[PDB]
Amino acid sequence: TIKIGINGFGRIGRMVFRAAQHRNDIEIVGINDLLDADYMAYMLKYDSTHGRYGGMVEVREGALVVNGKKIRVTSERDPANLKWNEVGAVVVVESTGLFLTDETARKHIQAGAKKVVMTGPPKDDTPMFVMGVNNTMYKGQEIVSNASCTTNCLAPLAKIIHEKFGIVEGLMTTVHATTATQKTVDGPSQKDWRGGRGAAQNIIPSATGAAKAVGKVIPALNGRLTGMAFRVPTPNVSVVDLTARLERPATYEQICAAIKAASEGELKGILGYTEDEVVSTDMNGVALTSVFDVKAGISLNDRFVKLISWYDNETGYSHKVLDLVAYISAH
Amino acid sequence: TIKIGINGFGRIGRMVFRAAQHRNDIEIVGINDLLDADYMAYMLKYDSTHGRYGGMVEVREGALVVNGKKIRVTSERDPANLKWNEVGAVVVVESTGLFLTDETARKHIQAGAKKVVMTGPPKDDTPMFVMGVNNTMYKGQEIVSNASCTTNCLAPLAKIIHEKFGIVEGLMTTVHATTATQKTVDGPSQKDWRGGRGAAQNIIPSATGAAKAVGKVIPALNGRLTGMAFRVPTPNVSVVDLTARLERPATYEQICAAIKAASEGELKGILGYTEDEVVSTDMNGVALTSVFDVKAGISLNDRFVKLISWYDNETGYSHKVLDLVAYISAH
Ligand SMILES: NC(=O)c1ccc[n+]([C@@H]2O[C@H](COP(=O)([O-])OP(=O)(O)OC[C@H]3O[C@@H](n4cnc5c(N)ncnc54)[C@H](O)[C@@H]3O)[C@@H](O)[C@H]2O)c1
Numbered sequence: 085t086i087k088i089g090i091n092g093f094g095r096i097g098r099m100v101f102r103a104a105q106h107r108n109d110i111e112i113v114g115i116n117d118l119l120d121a122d123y124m125a126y127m128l129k130y131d132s133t134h135g136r137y138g139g140m141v142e143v144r145e146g147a148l149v150v151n152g153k154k155i156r157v158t159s160e161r162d163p164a165n166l167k168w169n170e171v172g173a174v175v176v177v178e179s180t181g182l183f184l185t186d187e188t189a190r191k192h193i194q195a196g197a198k199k200v201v202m203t204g205p206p207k208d209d210t211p212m213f214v215m216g217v218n219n220t221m222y223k224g225q226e227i228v229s230n231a232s233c234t235t236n237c238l239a240p241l242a243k244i245i246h247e248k249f250g251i252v253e254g255l256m257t258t259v260h261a262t263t264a265t266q267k268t269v270d271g272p273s274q275k276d277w278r279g280g281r282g283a284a285q286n287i288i289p290s291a292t293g294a295a296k297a298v299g300k301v302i303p304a305l306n307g308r309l310t311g312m313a314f315r316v317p318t319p320n321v322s323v324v325d326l327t328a329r330l331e332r333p334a335t336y337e338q339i340c341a342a343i344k345a346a347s348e349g350e351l352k353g354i355l356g357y358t359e360d361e362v363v364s365t366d367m368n369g370v371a372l373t374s375v376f377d378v379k380a381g382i383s384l385n386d387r388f389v390k391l392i393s394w395y396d397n398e399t400g401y402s403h404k405v406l407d408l409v410a411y412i413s414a415h
Numbered sequence: 416t417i418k419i420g421i422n423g424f425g426r427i428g429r430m431v432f433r434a435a436q437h438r439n440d441i442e443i444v445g446i447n448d449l450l451d452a453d454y455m456a457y458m459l460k461y462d463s464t465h466g467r468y469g470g471m472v473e474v475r476e477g478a479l480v481v482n483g484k485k486i487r488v489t490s491e492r493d494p495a496n497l498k499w500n501e502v503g504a505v506v507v508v509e510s511t512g513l514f515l516t517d518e519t520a521r522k523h524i525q526a527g528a529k530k531v532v533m534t535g536p537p538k539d540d541t542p543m544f545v546m547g548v549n550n551t552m553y554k555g556q557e558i559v560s561n562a563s564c565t566t567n568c569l570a571p572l573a574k575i576i577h578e579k580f581g582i583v584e585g586l587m588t589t590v591h592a593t594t595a596t597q598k599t600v601d602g603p604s605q606k607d608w609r610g611g612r613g614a615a616q617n618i619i620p621s622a623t624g625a626a627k628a629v630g631k632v633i634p635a636l637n638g639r640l641t642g643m644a645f646r647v648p649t650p651n652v653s654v655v656d657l658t659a660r661l662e663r664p665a666t667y668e669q670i671c672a673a674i675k676a677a678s679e680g681e682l683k684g685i686l687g688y689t690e691d692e693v694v695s696t697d698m699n700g701v702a703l704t705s706v707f708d709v710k711a712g713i714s715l716n717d718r719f720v721k722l723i724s725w726y727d728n729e730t731g732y733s734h735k736v737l738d739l740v741a742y743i744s745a746h
């Protein structure tokens with residue numbers, strides 16, 4: 085069993101925790117945040133988006149006891165102090181949002197861990213992996229990134245479309261749920277002025293590197309994709325809108341058939357497929373990283389198409405963080 | 416002044432009413448809905464989106480008195496019974512959403528009006544006009560349409576881009592505010608299943624003919640544009656995202672300069688321009704039909720670009736309804 089630590093018990097930290105509770109191959113042995121143990125237990129027990137936790141949670145002698153297993157709780161702001169080897173944590177999930185460079189993430193190795201997975205795109209040349217797209221390119225690196233939720237939705241889709249028909253060029257928009265970085269009412273966001281504006285009141289444009297990042301995980305698409313985002317007033321679940329110019333002609337039904345085939349084969353469990361009249365809440369809790377929406381998209385012609393794919397930005401990404409942990413542990 | 420009637424005193428009906436109150440060339444002489452005069456006064460007086468009406472509103476002898484002028488209030492379900500001649504209403508704004516064919520709209524002419532402006536796209540081949548784009552093509556027709564809010568946003572933008580650089584092909588997404596057709600909680604929408612789902616809970620994909628309609632008001636673009644929509648949990652203000660392949664190379668700066676020039680010249684008061692870090696609420700109450708957002712869009716390369724333009728779907732469209740009324744009255 086792979087023993088892991090979580091640094092940052094936030095939306096992703098807690099949903100990674102939840103995702104682990106039905107896996108036999110991974111066990112959480114310690115959690116670090118800026119919280120007392122009793123408060124951590126409360127944050128795990130109750131969830132506005134995903135409902136009440138479906139295990140037993142208690143606090144005993146300053147540790148979390150979840151379904152019988154003791155979990156060390158610490159509140160070290162500096163992860164270099166974490167003594168991960170003392171609880172046998174070999175991989176740390178770095179989900180604070182704050183430690184996205186080699187130097188900062190490597191504090192966990194200074195503290196006794198063997199490997200680290202960042203839960204966001206790096207600010208340096210730390211390698212990014214996306215399950216089902218380029219994870220097999222892993223070369224034993226101690227510190228890696230699982231990219232972003234948006235990259236995890238776009239990349240599996242772009243893989244299939246590019247392999248089957250070729251992407252000459254593509255532009256992406258993601259319509260994305262509100263996140264923790266945003267504000268309830270207009271407030272200060274000195275590095276992202278639009279992102280300070282009240283989240284529930286507004287459609288809020290945002291830059292995103294997620295489309296360009298697809299060219300890092302699919303090198304054939306380097307320079308062939310970019311995009312942007314709109315943040316909107318929903319609490320979870322997002323959607324990619326990819327407008328692509330194709331190398332070779334394909335009707336909309338041929339495109340749908342290729343995606344369906346991929347969802348049943350190579351990308352099973354990663355890329356999914358629906359023909360139902362779905363809305364965002366229908367994807368809340370779905371562990372797929374990309375769910376292609378047949379009826380939502382549209383072709384102008386045989387070489388210019390708009391493709392729509394959903395992603396539960398909390399749940400799917402979190403399950404794939406653990407898939408990446410398992411992958412790098414076996415390789 | 417041009418004496419007009421309004422049929423359907425809803426979001427558009429009321430915002431058309433509000434748009435008329437600082438024009439000296441148009442006078443509202445009668446309003447029809449399914450409502451008592453006292454309730455109609457209440458609906459005008461108070462508005463969740465646009466605030467309190469800034470005039471005096473009184474009810475006297477079952478008519479509205481607004482700023483000391485008498486306005487007839489009726490509640491005829493069948494517009495053939497409206498006796499528009501009795502109040503001297505020459506043009507009728509048809510804003511119920513129900514009478515979008517020649518035969519249904521023409522009931523107003525049977526009822527004594529001379530011309531009708533439908534406030535949505537027709538279900539038949541009634542001619543559509545967009546101010547600044549094809550209104551000069553008007554040929555004296557009795558029954559016309561002002562198209563949709565979305566077409567009024569996209570058409571002025573597409574006009575500038577096509578005229579300056581040429582559009583090979585384009586695909587549009589609009590991220591659109593909730594409207595009256597939607598439901599507060601999951602409810603019945605037999606002709607539009609997704610649109611029945613709870614509006615405030617969901618991102619809701621939706622079909623729209625607005626991009627294809629641009630090809631009717633700009634014939635050179637026939638067959639070159641299509642698109643779709645996402646409905647999101649905001650009360651007003653929407654945005655167009657146009658992804659276009661260009662006939663000749665243009666930098667993002669050159670594109671912006673062409674839009675700025677059009678906004679100051681030919682399309683002044685129709686298409687606007689901002690370089691600020693705006694969000695949707697900043698456009699609430701803006702009477703422009705298209706507001707180009709410099710910082711939100713992005714070029715992949717000199718021939719493939721994503722262009723973002725806002726629209727207050729209530730206010731902009733309503734002002735342009737009155738501009739069309741004035742135009743058809745003088746031509
Ligand atoms: N929410 C999503 O949809 C999503 C999806 C994919 C990736 N991500 C990424 O994952 C990261 C976390 O996102 P989130 O949405 O979970 O954020 P979040 O704000 O919900 O969680 C961050 C947590 O880190 C804790 N924290 C802050 N400083 C700390 C420190 N010095 N030591 C320990 N804990 C600390 C906070 O108390 C909080 O519980 C970010 O990089 C984000 O971009 C988020």
Ligand SMILES: NC(=O)c1ccc[n+]([C@@H]2O[C@H](COP(=O)([O-])OP(=O)(O)OC[C@H]3O[C@@H](n4cnc5c(N)ncnc54)[C@H](O)[C@@H]3O)[C@@H](O)[C@H]2O)c1
Pocket residue numbers: 422423424425426427428447448449491492493510511512513534535562563564594595596728729732
């Ligand atoms: N709201 C927008 O953003 C927007 C923008 C552009 C165009 N439009 C179009 O304008 C039209 C009206 O839209 P809205 O959003 O104002 O709708 P709405 O539902 O707010 O208003 C419709 C009004 O018509 C009244 N009505 C219904 N049946 C009637 C009848 N038989 N006789 C008289 N009145 C009747 C209703 O009581 C209601 O007040 C629709 O075609 C819509 O697509 C709407």
